[PDB]
Amino acid sequence: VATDELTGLFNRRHFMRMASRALEDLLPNRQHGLALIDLDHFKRINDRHGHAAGDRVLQTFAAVARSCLRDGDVLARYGGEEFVLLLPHADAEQLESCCERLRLAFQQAEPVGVTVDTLSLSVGMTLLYADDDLDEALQRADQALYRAKRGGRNRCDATWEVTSA
Numbered sequence: 001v002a003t004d005e006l007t008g009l010f011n012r013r014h015f016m017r018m019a020s021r022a023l024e025d026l027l028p029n030r031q032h033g034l035a036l037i038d039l040d041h042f043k044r045i046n047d048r049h050g051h052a053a054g055d056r057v058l059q060t061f062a063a064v065a066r067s068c069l070r071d072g073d074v075l076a077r078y079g080g081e082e083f084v085l086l087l088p089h090a091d092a093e094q095l096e097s098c099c100e101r102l103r104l105a106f107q108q109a110e111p112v113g114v115t116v117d118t119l120s121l122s123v124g125m126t127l128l129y130a131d132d133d134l135d136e137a138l139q140r141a142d143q144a145l146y147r148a149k150r151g152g153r154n155r156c157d158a159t160w161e162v163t164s165a
């Protein structure tokens with residue numbers, strides 16, 4: 001009920017409670033790192049390879065990602081093939097380091113019993129400050145994620161960076 005049976009990660013509803021608490025505990029001059037993560041071409045993989053193969057790709061991501069996180073970092077299912085990452089007390093440099101490490105590591109991953117072409121991630125990153133609301137921050141992250149996707153995927157974009165037009 002707290003975890004996703006497939007990946008072993010926290011599920012969305014539990015994450016929201018964890019992240020909500022962490023945000024309320026946030027001191028004036030401090031911040032958390034927050035990111036939304038999409039597994040690129042998941043539907044294409046599921047379509048060509050089948051549902052069980054898609055499951056193995058979700059599980060491969062979870063395994064890869066766990067190895068990138070610190071003690072106290074939180075990663076959860078967000079819905080579909082999307083994931084949400086909270087890095088307590090992290091700044092932009094740390095958040096970007098983590099997300100780039102995840103991106104590169106997933107690209108190098110090898111899911112058992114599948115022969116996918118390319119695995120890649122798109123990531124939208126933002127920072128969480130005291131007095132922010134979690135749902136508005138998730139919205140901000142999702143905007144950066146949109147830019148990552150529209151920009152060709154396999155990339156991390158952030159709300160603190162200049163956008164295109």
Ligand SMILES: [Mg+2]
Binds near residue numbers: 038039081082
């Ligand atoms: Mg997707």
